[PDB]
Amino acid sequence: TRTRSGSLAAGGLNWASLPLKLFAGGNAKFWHPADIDFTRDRADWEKLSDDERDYATRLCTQFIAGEEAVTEDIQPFMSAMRAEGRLADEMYLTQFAFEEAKHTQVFRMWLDAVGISEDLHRYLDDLPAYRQIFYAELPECLNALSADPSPAAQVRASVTYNHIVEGMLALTGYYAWHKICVERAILPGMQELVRRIGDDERRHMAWGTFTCRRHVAADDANWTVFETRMNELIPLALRLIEEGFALYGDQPPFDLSKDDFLQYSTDKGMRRFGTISNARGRPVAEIDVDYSPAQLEDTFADEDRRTLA
Template sequence: MSLTRDIEPSRHLGFGGGARTGHRPDPVPRQLLRDGNAAFWNPDDIDLTRDEADFATLSPGERRLTCLFVANLIAVGESAPQDLQPFVTAMATENRRDDETYLTQLVFEEAQHAQALRTWFDAVGMSDSLPWFTENGDVRRRSFLEELSWSLYALTDDQSPAAQIRAAVTHNHILEGCLGLTCYTAGAQICRNRGILPGLLRILEHIAADERRHVAWGTFTCRRHLAADDENWAIVLQRTQELLPLATEMIGEMLAPFGPGAPFGISMQGLMGSALSDVGRRLDSVARARGRHPEEVDRDHSPMRLEDEIEMDGNRSGGEDDRRTVVSIRRPVRPAP
C-alpha cells in the first residue's frame, strides 16, 4: 500500500519500512545504496606523502592544469550538499523512500569527494591558491551557478516528473557523467601512464566508482518517468541538447590558456569524444524504458550494468596499464531483469 507523506513537522501519515517485498530484486535505489555501503572509503586512509614530491617535478603548465581539474571537481562536491536538498525533498514528497535514502548517501559522498580532493590540495602545498582556480571562468559560472542551481532549486516549488528529469539530466548525466567522469578518467590515466601522484590516483578511482552509481540513479530516474509517460522523452532530449554545448565549452575554457599544446597531451577531442559517446549510451538506456511498466523499470538494474560496461570499455581502450586497478572495489553481480 502506498503512503502519502507530508514532510512538515509531525505530519507523517505512516511508515513503510516494514512492507513486504517478497523475493523480487531490490529496487534500483536500494541496490545502489547497498553498493555504496560495500564500497565505503575514508579519505584520511589515503597516503599522500609521495604526491608532494611528484607534484614538484611537474612543469608549470602541468601543475596548473592538474589544479584546474581538481579545483573544479572540488567545486562540484562542495555545492552538492546544498544544491541537492530540493531533490531529496521531492523524493520524500513523492514517497520514494528508497530514492530519498539513496540521495542522502549521494549527498554524503559528494561532500566526501570534496574533502578528499581538498586534502590533496593541502598536501601538495596549493591550498592558498585554490580560490584562484575556481573563481574565474564565465562558462564555469554559468554551469554551476545558473544551469545547475536553476534546475535543482526549481524542485522546491515544482516536483513534477518534468522538473525531476531536468534536474537529473543536469546534475547526474551532464555534470557528473559528462564533465565529472571525463575529468576523473583522464586524470587517473595520466597518473597511471606517468607513474605519478599515487594518492591522487586512489582518490580519483574511488570517486569515479561513486560517480558511476550517481549517474546510474539519474538514468534510472529518467527511465521511471518515461515508463510512466512517454511524452517525457522529449524533455530528456531537450535538456540534454541544451547542456551538451555548455559542457563542451567548459572543457574548452579550462584548456584555452594552454593553446594548442595542452599539458599531458590532453585535447578537446580526446576528452569529449568518449564523453559524448557515453551520453549517447545513457540516452539509449533511457529510451528502452518506453512502453514498459513502471514497476518493472523500478527493479531493472540495467542502468547500473551500463555504467559497469562503460567503465570496462574505457579501461580496455586505454591499454594494459589502464586495466590495472589500484583500489579494490567490491562489485556485486548485477541480476538480470
C-alpha cells in the same frame, strides 16, 4: 504533517528495488579517505613545471568546486522524494549526498598534501562556462524541484546532475587525471582518489538512469523533456572543455589534445540517450525492480578501462 511510515508497511522495504540495491552496494563498497596514502604525491608535485602545476591545480579546482556543488544541490531532490513519498529513493539519496561530501573531503586532503593553501577562486575566473554550469544551471534547475517536484522537473534535474555533470563532465575529468597521473607514473594518491570516487560515481549515474527511466516509462511525454535538456546541456559542457584548452593556447601541458577530449566527452554525453530510451514502452512496475541501470554502468566502466589499453 506525517500520517504513515513506509518501513511499517506490509512486506516492509522492497530489497529488489533499484534505489535500495544501489544503497546496499554503497555500504559494501564504502571506503575511508584516511586509507589513501598521500605521503608520496608532494615529491612528484614539486618535480613538475610551473605550467604543469597550473593545469592540475585548475582541474582539481574544477573538481572540488563541482563536488561541493553536488553535495549542496542534491538536497532538493531528497526533498522532492520526501514529498513524493518514495522512501527507497530517499534513503539512497542520503548515501548519495554523504558520498559527495566525502569526495569534497578527499580532494581537499589532496590539496593539503601537495601544500596548496591559497584561495583558488581565480582558477575558475577564466572559465565562464564552468560557472554557468555549477553556479547557475546546476542549482537553479535542481532548486526548482522545491517548488515543482513534477515528473518533468525531476528529469530536467536528473539530466543536469546525473547525466551531464556526472555522466559527461566528471568522466571527462577522470580521463584528464588518467592522462596526467597514469601515463607519467606520478601522483599515486590522486590516482587512488580518482579510482575510489569513480566507484561511488557509478551508483550515482545508475540512479540518474533509474529516475529518468521510471518517468519515461510512465509518461512518454518525458522522453522529449529528457532530449531537450540533454540538447541544451551538451553544447555548454563542450564549451567548458574548449575554454580550459584555449587558456593554454590550444596547446596545453601533459600533451593533451583538444579534439581528443571533445571526442571523448561527446561519447560520454551521447551514450546517455541509449541508457534511457529502452524504457519507452516498458511498464513502470518492472523499472522499479530492474537492476540493469547499475549493470549498464558497470559495463560502461568496463568499456572505458578497455579503451585506455
